[PDB]
Design a protein around this ligand. Structure first.
Ligand SMILES: CC(=O)Oc1ccccc1S(=O)(=O)Nc1cc2c(c(O)c1O)C(=O)c1ccccc1C2=O
Ligand SMILES: [Cl-]
Lengths: 233, 234
C-alpha cells in the first residue's frame, strides 16, 4: 500500500505557539528544534525513504523539514513550499496570549471562537503590530486579494489546504512517490479530516502531537487501511 | 542593468580538509565551511539582496550552503530546485584518494597532465572502487540514463552536462525576471562563468572560485555581463 508521513513542527520562539502564532513567521525555539531532530532519528532508525517533500512558506515548518532531511541523509530530495499549508491565520488575535485575548474580547466571545468550526476571529487591522509584516510580506505578493486572509476560521484554513492536497500531493502519491509533509497543526488537521472523513466536531477535538512522525498506510483509493501510527517509543 | 545573478561555491567540506578528491562523493561541510557559508549569507543580507528562486546540486555541501545562506537572509521560504547537473566534477577512480595516494599510484607527471588538461578525464571509477556503490548506486541517480551516469569526467564533460540545465531551466527564469541564486560547485559554476564571459579553455582552467563567497553578475537582457564579476564581503 501507499505510505504517507506527516510531521507537525514543535515549539516556536517566545512562546508564540501559545500566542496564536498563526501567519507570523516565528522560528523554532531550540527545544522545538530538538523535537524535530528526535523525530528525524525515529525515521532514520526506521529506515524510511522519501521521494518528495511538501511544506509551508513558514520557517518553523521549513526548518523542521530541514532537520528531518538532515537526520535521515536525504537533503537531496525535491522540496515544494506552499502558503496553502500555512498555519491557520488567527487575524487580530495573532501574538496575543490567553489572558490578553480574554481581556480584550471577553470570555464569552473567546469560548465561541474556540468551539466554532466556521467562525473566524476578527481581522488583523493596520494597527496590529504584525499587520504590514504579514500582509505585505513579498512571499504572498502573487496572492489575489481574496486568497490573502486577514483572518481564518478552521473551515477557511481547511478549504485552502485541500486544493493543494488534491492537485499537487495526490498525483505524487498515486505514482508511488513516498511523500513527506512538514506543516502545522491546523493545515495537517485538514488533511487528516479528508483522509479519515472525520466530522467538524471530531477534527476540532483532534490534537496532533508535535515533532513525531505520523504514518498513514493508504489503499489505491487513498483511504487509510488503519489508524494513524507514531514513531519513537 | 536589466538582470542580477548571484553564484556561490559551497563552503570548505570535510574532505577538502583531508585533501581527498570528493567529486560525486557527498561530503558534508566542515565547521569552517559552514562558517564561510554563514559569512556569505551575512554579506548578501547587509547588501539587501533578494531572490525569487534558488538552484543547487544534489550534493549536501552545496545544499547546506544554500540553507545557511537562506537562513542568514531570512528567505527560507523561497522555491529551491535541485539537480545532479550542477554536481561537482566526477573524479572517477581518484575519488577518495588524497594528494599522496594520487601521486604515489600515478606519478607526479600524470597528475600534472590531468591537472592542466581541459578534456582528458581521470581514470574511470570501476565496480571494485570502494566508493562505486556509494555513488553509482545511490538512488538519487536512479532516473539518469546509462549515458548520463558518468564513471568519470573531464572538466569538459562536466560543463557539457551542466550547460543544458543552465539554458533550459535557469535562463528562462532569469528572462522571466526572477532573481536567481545558484549555490553549487567550483567546476559546475565554471561552466556557467565560461558561458557568461565567453572564456577560453585555458582561461577557465585558470579560474579559481573561492569557497563560500557570493559572486555577483550584472547582466543585460541577453544575459551578457555589463561588467566583471564581483565578490561580496568585507
Ligand atoms: C596529487 C594530487 O592531485 O593531490 C591533490 C589532492 C587534492 C587536492 C590537491 C592536490 S595537488 O597538490 O596535487 N594540487 C592539485 C591537484 C589537482 C588539481 C588541482 O586544482 C590542484 O590544485 C586538479 O584540478 C585536478 C583535476 C583533474 C585531475 C587531477 C587534478 C589534480 O590532481
Ligand atoms: Cl529546501
Amino acid at each position: 500500500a501507499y505510505k504517507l508521513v506527516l510531521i507537525r513542527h514543535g515549539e516556536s520562539a517566545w512562546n508564540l505557539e501559545n500566542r496564536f502564532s498563526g501567519w507570523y513567521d516565528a522560528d523554532l525555539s531550540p527545544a522545538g528544534h530538538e523535537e524535530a531532530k528526535r523525530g528525524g532519528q525515529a525515521l532514520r532508525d526506521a529506515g524510511y525513504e522519501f521521494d518528495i517533500c511538501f511544506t509551508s512558506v513558514q520557517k518553523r515548518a521549513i526548518r523542521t523539514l530541514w532537520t528531518v532531511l538532515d537526520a535521515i541523509d536525504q537533503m537531496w530530495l525535491p522540496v515544494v513550499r506552499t502558503w496553502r499549508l500555512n498555519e491557520r491565520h488567527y487575524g487580530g488575535l495573532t501574538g496575543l496570549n490567553k489572558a490578553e485575548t480574554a481581556a480584550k474580547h471577553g470570555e464569552a466571545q473567546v469560548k465561541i471562537w474556540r468551539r466554532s468550526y466556521d467562525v473566524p476571529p476578527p481581522p488583523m487591522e493596520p494597527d496590529h503590530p504584525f499587520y504590514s509584516n504579514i500582509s505585505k510580506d513579498r512571499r504572498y505578493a502573487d496572492l489575489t486579494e481574496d486568497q490573502l486572509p486577514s483572518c481564518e476560521s478552521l473551515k477557511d484554513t481547511i478549504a485552502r489546504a485541500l486544493p493543494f492536497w488534491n492537485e499537487e500531493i495526490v498525483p505524487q502519491i498515486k505514482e508511488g512517490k513516498r511523500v513527506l509533509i512538514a506543516a502545522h497543526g491546523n493545515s495537517l488537521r485538514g488533511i487528516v479530516k479528508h483522509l479519515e472523513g472525520l466530522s467538524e466536531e471530531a477534527i476540532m477535538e483532534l490534537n496532533l502531537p508535535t515533532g513525531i512522525p505520523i504514518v498513514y498506510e493508504l489503499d489505491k483509493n487513498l483511504k487509510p487501511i488503519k489508524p494513524m501510527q507514531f514513531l519513537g517509543d
